[PDB]
Design an enzyme around this catalytic site. Structure first.
Site, PDB file in Angstrom:
ATOM      1  N   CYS A 238       0.870  -1.099  -0.075  1.00  0.00           N
ATOM      2  CA  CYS A 238      -0.207   0.514   0.332  1.00  0.00           C
ATOM      3  C   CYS A 238       0.616   1.410   0.349  1.00  0.00           C
ATOM      4  CB  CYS A 238      -0.868  -0.337   1.272  1.00  0.00           C
ATOM      5  SG  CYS A 238      -2.188   0.489   1.090  1.00  0.00           S
TER       6      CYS A 238
ATOM      7  N   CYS B 212      -8.555   5.376  -8.294  1.00  0.00           N
ATOM      8  CA  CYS B 212      -7.415   6.048  -6.534  1.00  0.00           C
ATOM      9  C   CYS B 212      -6.944   7.310  -6.991  1.00  0.00           C
ATOM     10  CB  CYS B 212      -6.247   5.106  -7.145  1.00  0.00           C
ATOM     11  SG  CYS B 212      -6.061   3.414  -6.364  1.00  0.00           S
TER      12      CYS B 212
HETATM   13  C1  LIG Z   1      -3.193   5.139   4.876  1.00  0.00           C
HETATM   14  C2  LIG Z   1      -4.429   4.598   4.198  1.00  0.00           C
HETATM   15  C3  LIG Z   1      -5.038   5.438   3.410  1.00  0.00           C
HETATM   16  C4  LIG Z   1      -5.653   4.375   2.358  1.00  0.00           C
HETATM   17  N1  LIG Z   1      -6.350   5.603   1.395  1.00  0.00           N
HETATM   18  C5  LIG Z   1      -7.281   4.955   0.304  1.00  0.00           C
HETATM   19  C6  LIG Z   1      -7.642   5.831  -0.687  1.00  0.00           C
HETATM   20  O1  LIG Z   1      -7.799   6.926  -0.818  1.00  0.00           O
HETATM   21  N2  LIG Z   1      -8.369   5.345  -1.726  1.00  0.00           N
HETATM   22  C7  LIG Z   1      -8.436   3.777  -1.316  1.00  0.00           C
HETATM   23  O2  LIG Z   1      -9.365   3.450  -2.819  1.00  0.00           O
HETATM   24  N3  LIG Z   1      -7.818   2.871  -0.257  1.00  0.00           N
HETATM   25  C8  LIG Z   1      -7.434   3.223   0.522  1.00  0.00           C
HETATM   26  N4  LIG Z   1      -6.529   2.557   0.906  1.00  0.00           N
HETATM   27  C9  LIG Z   1      -6.614   1.166   1.295  1.00  0.00           C
HETATM   28  C10 LIG Z   1      -7.823   0.293   1.695  1.00  0.00           C
HETATM   29  O3  LIG Z   1      -8.846   0.797   1.524  1.00  0.00           O
HETATM   30  C11 LIG Z   1      -8.383   0.478   3.272  1.00  0.00           C
HETATM   31  O4  LIG Z   1      -7.225   0.176   4.478  1.00  0.00           O
HETATM   32  C12 LIG Z   1      -9.578  -0.542   3.986  1.00  0.00           C
HETATM   33  O5  LIG Z   1     -10.053  -0.020   4.996  1.00  0.00           O
HETATM   34  C13 LIG Z   1      -9.488  -1.549   3.674  1.00  0.00           C
HETATM   35  O6  LIG Z   1     -11.078  -2.308   4.161  1.00  0.00           O
HETATM   36  P1  LIG Z   1     -10.414  -3.825   4.785  1.00  0.00           P
HETATM   37  O7  LIG Z   1     -12.146  -3.721   5.312  1.00  0.00           O
HETATM   38  O8  LIG Z   1      -9.592  -4.558   4.268  1.00  0.00           O
HETATM   39  O9  LIG Z   1      -9.979  -2.974   6.361  1.00  0.00           O
HETATM   40  P2  LIG Z   1      -9.400  -2.161   7.528  1.00  0.00           P
HETATM   41  O10 LIG Z   1      -8.955  -1.585   8.133  1.00  0.00           O
HETATM   42  O11 LIG Z   1     -11.061  -1.420   7.093  1.00  0.00           O
HETATM   43  O12 LIG Z   1     -11.260  -2.677   8.419  1.00  0.00           O
HETATM   44  C14 LIG Z   1     -11.128  -4.200   9.141  1.00  0.00           C
HETATM   45  C15 LIG Z   1     -11.583  -3.668  10.278  1.00  0.00           C
HETATM   46  O13 LIG Z   1     -11.429  -5.633  10.973  1.00  0.00           O
HETATM   47  C16 LIG Z   1     -11.603  -4.905  12.600  1.00  0.00           C
HETATM   48  N5  LIG Z   1     -10.641  -5.960  12.803  1.00  0.00           N
HETATM   49  C17 LIG Z   1      -9.202  -6.888  12.719  1.00  0.00           C
HETATM   50  N6  LIG Z   1      -8.601  -7.742  13.518  1.00  0.00           N
HETATM   51  C18 LIG Z   1      -9.945  -8.172  13.994  1.00  0.00           C
HETATM   52  C19 LIG Z   1     -10.071  -9.085  15.064  1.00  0.00           C
HETATM   53  N7  LIG Z   1      -9.199 -10.035  15.583  1.00  0.00           N
HETATM   54  N8  LIG Z   1     -11.116  -9.439  15.286  1.00  0.00           N
HETATM   55  C20 LIG Z   1     -12.177  -8.969  14.690  1.00  0.00           C
HETATM   56  N9  LIG Z   1     -12.512  -7.320  14.158  1.00  0.00           N
HETATM   57  C21 LIG Z   1     -10.782  -7.225  13.819  1.00  0.00           C
HETATM   58  C22 LIG Z   1     -10.335  -3.900  12.767  1.00  0.00           C
HETATM   59  O14 LIG Z   1     -10.329  -2.941  13.842  1.00  0.00           O
HETATM   60  C23 LIG Z   1     -11.472  -2.903  11.361  1.00  0.00           C
HETATM   61  O15 LIG Z   1     -12.553  -2.644  11.476  1.00  0.00           O
HETATM   62  C24 LIG Z   1      -5.905   3.254   2.700  1.00  0.00           C
HETATM   63  C25 LIG Z   1      -5.517   2.421   3.363  1.00  0.00           C
HETATM   64  C26 LIG Z   1      -4.762   2.710   4.258  1.00  0.00           C
HETATM   65  C27 LIG Z   1      -3.934   2.311   5.098  1.00  0.00           C
HETATM   66  S1  LIG Z   1      -1.812   1.577   5.863  1.00  0.00           S
HETATM   67  C1  LIG Z   2     -24.761  11.968  -9.574  1.00  0.00           C
HETATM   68  C2  LIG Z   2     -23.639  11.418  -9.434  1.00  0.00           C
HETATM   69  C3  LIG Z   2     -23.287   9.830  -8.794  1.00  0.00           C
HETATM   70  C4  LIG Z   2     -21.708   9.661  -8.578  1.00  0.00           C
HETATM   71  C5  LIG Z   2     -21.891   8.463  -8.184  1.00  0.00           C
HETATM   72  C6  LIG Z   2     -20.052   8.118  -7.083  1.00  0.00           C
HETATM   73  C7  LIG Z   2     -19.343   7.294  -7.763  1.00  0.00           C
HETATM   74  C8  LIG Z   2     -18.713   6.743  -6.685  1.00  0.00           C
HETATM   75  C9  LIG Z   2     -17.137   6.663  -6.713  1.00  0.00           C
HETATM   76  C10 LIG Z   2     -15.609   5.687  -7.173  1.00  0.00           C
HETATM   77  C11 LIG Z   2     -15.505   5.727  -6.620  1.00  0.00           C
HETATM   78  C12 LIG Z   2     -15.100   4.433  -5.682  1.00  0.00           C
HETATM   79  C13 LIG Z   2     -15.839   3.576  -5.071  1.00  0.00           C
HETATM   80  C14 LIG Z   2     -13.970   4.505  -4.875  1.00  0.00           C
HETATM   81  O1  LIG Z   2     -13.751   2.718  -3.952  1.00  0.00           O
HETATM   82  C15 LIG Z   2     -12.610   5.349  -4.556  1.00  0.00           C
HETATM   83  O2  LIG Z   2     -12.190   4.615  -3.721  1.00  0.00           O
HETATM   84  C16 LIG Z   2     -11.473   4.921  -2.058  1.00  0.00           C
HETATM   85  C17 LIG Z   2     -12.907   6.392  -5.481  1.00  0.00           C
HETATM   86  O3  LIG Z   2     -11.993   6.639  -5.490  1.00  0.00           O
HETATM   87  C18 LIG Z   2     -11.885   8.018  -4.631  1.00  0.00           C
HETATM   88  C19 LIG Z   2     -13.714   6.384  -6.218  1.00  0.00           C
HETATM   89  O4  LIG Z   2     -14.066   7.848  -7.226  1.00  0.00           O
END
Ligand SMILES: Cc1cc2nc3c(=O)[nH]c(=O)nc-3n(C[C@H](O)[C@H](O)[C@H](O)COP(=O)(O)OP(=O)(O)OC[C@H]3O[C@@H](n4cnc5c(N)ncnc54)[C@H](O)[C@@H]3O)c2cc1CS
Ligand SMILES: CCCCCCCCCCC1=C(C)C(=O)C(OC)=C(OC)C1=O
Ligand SMILES: Cc1cc2nc3c(=O)[nH]c(=O)nc-3n(C[C@H](O)[C@H](O)[C@H](O)COP(=O)(O)OP(=O)(O)OC[C@H]3O[C@@H](n4cnc5c(N)ncnc54)[C@H](O)[C@@H]3O)c2cc1CS
Ligand SMILES: Cc1cc2nc3c(=O)[nH]c(=O)nc-3n(C[C@H](O)[C@H](O)[C@H](O)COP(=O)(O)OP(=O)(O)OC[C@H]3O[C@@H](n4cnc5c(N)ncnc54)[C@H](O)[C@@H]3O)c2cc1CS
Ligand SMILES: CCCCCCCCCCCCO[C@@H]1O[C@H](CO)[C@@H](O[C@H]2O[C@H](CO)[C@@H](O)[C@H](O)[C@H]2O)[C@H](O)[C@H]1O
Ligand SMILES: CCCCCCCCCCCCO[C@@H]1O[C@H](CO)[C@@H](O[C@H]2O[C@H](CO)[C@@H](O)[C@H](O)[C@H]2O)[C@H](O)[C@H]1O
Ligand SMILES: CCCCCCCCCCCCO[C@@H]1O[C@H](CO)[C@@H](O[C@H]2O[C@H](CO)[C@@H](O)[C@H](O)[C@H]2O)[C@H](O)[C@H]1O
Ligand SMILES: CCCCCCCCCCC1=C(C)C(=O)C(OC)=C(OC)C1=O
Ligand SMILES: CCCCCCCCCCC1=C(C)C(=O)C(OC)=C(OC)C1=O
Lengths: 429, 429, 429
Positions: C155, C346
């Site tokens: 990441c 992204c």
């Molecule tokens: C810092 C950071 C930024 C970031 N930015 C992103 C972005 O701008 N766009 C994008 O598309 N993705 C970004 N990501 C990556 C990703 O979207 C994130 O990591 C998501 O959060 C991933 O989703 P997940 O469902 O895989 O994980 P989560 O962290 O949201 O949730 C996990 C949940 O599970 C709980 N948990 C952990 N261990 C547990 C046990 N043993 N038992 C019960 N529950 C448990 C935890 O508390 C949490 O609620 C970005 C990613 C980053 C990060 S480096």
């Molecule tokens: C009336 C207009 C309706 C707009 C609908 C929203 C479009 C959905 C956003 C797509 C998107 C997803 C799913 C998405 O997961 C993501 O990463 C966090 C984005 O980057 C910011 C995205 O742009």
């Protein structure tokens, strides 16, 4: 009635003398220079191209300086006695000072074997005019051209300008297709400039050269310039040759023997340049100041092939401003001292268009850069030439409005109050 | 009543024969070709893609050439006797000539092991038609694709075109995300083209391949093409492999046995291509000229993996003008000789849009280049195809307006007076 | 009614639970999470910058989930018995399931020596808040900053965001000229992202770092973070040192102990992540599904310094849609099974502007990419934040209009019928 002597009638010397004169009407100022004229250095590439007349880019100092009550001595300064507060000219005249401003510019070192005899340069008006003769020889019988910079160079811009201007001239003459062009530099990459690049200057210059079919070799050491070839060495120690009928290489700079004649507390042991602090004042002899290319400023980057930092016009005008305020404030027992910002607006003229570079400050990390190119920048270059020459002829290198305009457009503040001058020049206080 | 024999009914042969005819209506001209048709080579990638019918990009010559008083013999030239001024066909017809123009095009060398058997090529209409059959197999059973150039290749453009066209097709069929694409080349970098690049062509082609997810490997030697893999060797001598259901590779070029049959004064001992001077005339046998891909032109640069210079359509056309004028001038007792400019407008068709490359001259140093991309250039390529085909059918490959149009748009002059023909083709008089 | 247990109250867990609820109103659904809130992860870099309050980018789950007939257990899931179809919590509560969704997110590994102790991280809200506190100290006492990724990172985007956000902040505070910035990454080049680049992302990020004076070192392995410096090793095995007063490094990810507890048919030996097929179902236990970062997806390429594949928000929402349909169809004896497209939008927020990246799919071969940059992308990032949090609060992570709008603007279909689920996640059915 205090007495400052200024050694060197160029950008740094004239700017400092004029600043001092405008700050303090009641101050004695003697300017000593080995050339009877001020030479507008940014127009020396144009002079070499035969795009200027010498008379139009130079200003006789003898009938001019007395108009601003500055004594002009048209003699070379030979030695400095910093303990006695004396400068000795070549003729043996000893002139005592309360303050000394050293602004002698570069002493040119033609470090490649055969460079001074076999190549051309454009660093002085005299060398530039010699280059023009050699260019006329090139146009009559086209052959390969090699331009660039040897190891230790710290002024890269004029080389880029000259290469692009020459491309422009050969193209206008319809003979560019008969003249290979190669650019060879000690910079680790094109558009490094001894400053670690300015924004995306590397991508900019690489594209410029690609579009204009200027071949290039960076990160190498030009070791010899022969009448028929240029010899350079890469980092593996492998030697290569490139055919050349005409060459123009930048020499490296060192300090003059006049600076060397003062102690090792004044002349930097490695390069003979003037040892200065953040306030461009000598650390040991507090009444000695350095302004311009002659000042010892550490390289921004230790590059694989040694390179140094440029001292550009704007940087030098800022030094001159700081030094003048520093001398006047010392005279008046004002404890405030100034460091120059050492920011730079630089324009690389390419013929009908130009590269515009702004770096603030020049020494990284930077607050701000601007990298642009267009015809407008060429006209600005020409306009600034007219403007600056007017300033030399009219006794003020720092009119109030100029600072305001630069602040309005570029947020520039030329000098900063420096709470502690102790440190290398360009380091932040 | 002088007699010129032209060997080859392609771009070079047709252009030279037509030029000679328009210059000299009284001249006897015989054209020898093994193919009964002129084939518009620039549309062979399209033919391979199934985007052309063969009939639309070819012109039967037997019914046509008599209309311009050109004698057509549909036979392969077997041998040349330069001392007897004779050409012998495969059947055994001895044709005497006052002047000879050799324009047989490329003889193809499929240098990689298994290349002719397991790969595809687009260099002839016959080969391109086979490639279409194989593309249908690829669409039916999708798998990895690898396209490129083997060592010694001199014509890289069609490989880039084909790759981009195929990407376009795959994407239109909704199977691109199921078909990996890799481009492997003997070029030191993408967009070298065997010319040291054209302006920012490296940057441009890299970005293109990146935007379209075409993986690439440059500066390597393709050693073998197997039914399921491509094997290449790097500069360190290490062997590598890549999976491949479908491949398309450029073969390298050499001269034909018909050129070899003449002296080692006519056939280049290293590649069997025609030894010519600046005026595209044989140094030894002054009534022999070479036009087109068959001419021996030195590489622009010696690349880590051997690479040669392309002879593009505009280049060939200029050779044909120069050679036609040189023959006529010899007839008219006129000392004036001509060298072609060897500039090029090259358009790489990608499907819906195209890359536009202009280099003047192709062999450096260059006066100017233009590198552009857009939908317009694709429409320009199709427009030019129709235009050139029309020129073939209407008996003038160099109508006066075309030279004037090229002059006013691109500053092109196709031929120059050459004071001294002695030298390599493409070198400056 | 059947019973689905979802482990994890983050993007993947919430999306799967809501998708299931909307598909099947009578389905019993229990969500187990160790955090009492949903945290909007993409706003964590902004939280670290002090540009957000925690309560503005989080949603308390206990009062929310019952409104959607979802049982919330605010406990850490401790173990899984896949043979008994049970989950056990930390307090020892045994929960039986018909289907299980594992969505625990990344388990952080601070692999460089002294990293957890001496550096900062922004991967959780709790860590990001600590980073905010250490940033205040940097503004007070400016010095060298180094930001980046250790080996095995998957990441990278957030590191780029944080670096450019910090540059923006420092320029806002007018102290950027006092703060050297260096980016150090395991990526073979800038803008690799663990995906082999997205269009010209390398060229884009390089130019961007150059324009904003961010120095960088790629293709190296960060080995240690000391209070004083960062130590990295190049590919020659040589160790290097860079000075640092403030650092922010990404940790690498592994799977949790709860996954490891289910045995080697569920927990990938190498990383403890969930073994899934194309349909994000475990191959051995067909009633276990994985959604999110916790899923074992092979790397897009083996880079010289090991890196892994990002699981972005859009990819995970698509995993969630596919898994929900797969579960529902199993219950209803519908043999249709779905694989997620795994495309990604992204947006890397740089402060006042942002980089827009789109890759479809993320894993090559790609149908298309979009790489853009502008102020507009920053406003869309902020808008999307508000929109996603709304969706969490309103019980629908996949409103029908969103799929339609994504189809209209980017030609994306989130899930596809999969004729054969057997194979690696991301591989084509
Ligand atoms: C810092 C950071 C930024 C970031 N930015 C992103 C972005 O701008 N766009 C994008 O598309 N993705 C970004 N990501 C990556 C990703 O979207 C994130 O990591 C998501 O959060 C991933 O989703 P997940 O469902 O895989 O994980 P989560 O962290 O949201 O949730 C996990 C949940 O599970 C709980 N948990 C952990 N261990 C547990 C046990 N043993 N038992 C019960 N529950 C448990 C935890 O508390 C949490 O609620 C970005 C990613 C980053 C990060 S480096
Ligand atoms: C009336 C207009 C309706 C707009 C609908 C929203 C479009 C959905 C956003 C797509 C998107 C997803 C799913 C998405 O997961 C993501 O990463 C966090 C984005 O980057 C910011 C995205 O742009
Ligand atoms: C060829 C060239 C071009 C050039 N172009 C520039 C540009 O377009 N923009 C810009 O910002 N800077 C450019 N520079 C750099 C710089 O501005 C010039 O080098 C300045 O001229 C430097 O100013 P200085 O005051 O440091 O030096 P100077 O040469 O102008 O003046 C020195 C004076 O001192 C005299 N002198 C030398 N030794 C003496 C002794 N012993 N005794 C008495 N007097 C002495 C000398 O005659 C002169 O008057 C550009 C730079 C270049 C050059 S390579
Ligand atoms: C596939 C391909 C594409 C291609 N595209 C081009 C383009 O888009 N623009 C451009 O400017 N050039 C392109 N070229 C290169 C070049 O223009 C072509 O190769 C020309 O066809 C070269 O012209 P030549 O006259 O040199 O050769 P030719 O092949 O057209 O004609 C030769 C004729 O001679 C006959 N022949 C061979 N051997 C004979 C013997 N022994 N006796 C009698 N006649 C003989 C032969 O049948 C033919 O009629 C492009 C190039 C390519 C190809 S890889
Ligand atoms: C009296 C003021 C002196 C103080 C010096 C001020 C320095 C500030 C310079 C930085 C701003 C650059 O200034 C401006 O940049 C743009 C962007 O390339 C230039 O370029 C613009 O004009 C040209 C020519 O009409 C167009 O072809 C081009 O499409 C357009 O972008 C402008 O011609 C220039 O005026
Ligand atoms: C009359 C026959 C033509 C003779 C051949 C002359 C070749 C012309 C080469 C001159 C170089 C200028 O090249 C010129 O560049 C611009 C800049 O992108 C191109 O593209 C421009 O026009 C097209 C028109 O369809 C626009 O859709 C496009 O948005 C715009 O960028 C022109 O289509 C091209 O003609
Ligand atoms: C209503 C919700 C719909 C959004 C759904 C999400 C899908 C997003 C699809 C992205 C489409 C391409 O993204 C589009 O790129 C162009 C760049 O040419 C941007 O255009 C931007 O740059 C140009 C050129 O610098 C500026 O003059 C312009 O003011 C600026 O908006 C658009 O603002 C952006 O919307
Ligand atoms: C109304 C008249 C406008 C003139 C006032 C603006 C002049 C400021 C020029 C800035 C500048 C300086 C100081 C300068 O030293 C310099 O280097 C030689 C430049 O490069 C060409 C500059 O552009
Ligand atoms: C207004 C009347 C229209 C004038 C048409 C002139 C077109 C000249 C074609 C130039 C050209 C040549 C010679 C050419 O050889 C070539 O490559 C195959 C081109 O690219 C497709 C060219 O564009």
């Amino acid at each position: 009635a205090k007495h400052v002597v200024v050694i060197g009638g160029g950008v740094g010397g004239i700017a400092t003398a004029y600043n001092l004169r405008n700050l303090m009407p009641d101050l004695k100022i003697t300017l000593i220079s080995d050339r009877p004229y001020f030479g507008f250095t940014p127009a020396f590439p144009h002079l070499a191209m035969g795009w200027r007349k010498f008379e139009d880019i130079s200003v006789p100092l003898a009938p001019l300086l007395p108009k601003f009550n500055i004594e002009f001595i048209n003699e070379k300064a030979e030695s400095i006695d910093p303990d006695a507060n004396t400068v000795t000219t070549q003729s043996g005249k000893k002139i005592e000072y309360d303050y000394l401003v050293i602004a002698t510019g570069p002493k040119l070192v033609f470090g490649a074997e055969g460079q001074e005899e076999n190549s051309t340069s454009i660093c002085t008006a005299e060398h530039a005019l010699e280059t023009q003769k050699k260019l006329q020889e090139l146009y009559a019988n086209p052959g390969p051209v090699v331009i660039g910079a040897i190891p230790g160079v710290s002024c890269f811009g004029p080389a880029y300008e000259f290469a692009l201007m020459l491309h422009y001239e050969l193209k206008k003459r319809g003979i560019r297709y008969k003249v290979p062009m190669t650019f060879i530099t000690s910079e680790p990459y094109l558009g490094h400039f001894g400053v670690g690049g300015i924004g995306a200057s590397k991508r900019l210059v690489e594209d410029l050269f690609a579009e204009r079919n200027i071949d290039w070799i960076a990160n190498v050491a030009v070791k010899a310039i022969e009448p028929d070839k240029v010899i350079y060495e890469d980092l593996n120690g492998n030697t290569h040759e490139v055919p050349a009928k005409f060459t123009m290489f930048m020499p490296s700079f060192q300090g003059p023997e006049v600076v060397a004649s003062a102690g090792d507390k004044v002349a930097n042991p490695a390069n003979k340049m003037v040892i200065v602090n953040r306030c461009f004042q000598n650390p040991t002899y507090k009444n000695i100041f350095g302004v311009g290319v002659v000042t010892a400023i550490p390289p921004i980057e230790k590059t694989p092939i040694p390179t140094g930092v440029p001292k550009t016009g704007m940087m030098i005008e800022q030094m001159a401003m700081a030094v003048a305020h520093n001398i006047v404030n010392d005279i008046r027992n004002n404890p405030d001292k100034y460091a120059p910002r050492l920011s730079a607006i630089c324009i690389a003229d390419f013929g009908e268009d130009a590269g515009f570079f702004f770096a603030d400050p020049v020494i990284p990390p930077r607050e701000r850069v601007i990298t642009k190119m267009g015809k407008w920048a060429h006209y600005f270059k020409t306009a600034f030439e007219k403007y600056f020459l007017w300033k030399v002829r009219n006794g003020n290198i720092a009119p109030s409005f100029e600072e305001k305009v630069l602040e309005i457009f570029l947020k520039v503040h030329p000098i900063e109050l420096c709470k502690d001058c102790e440190g290398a020049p360009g380091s932040r206080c």
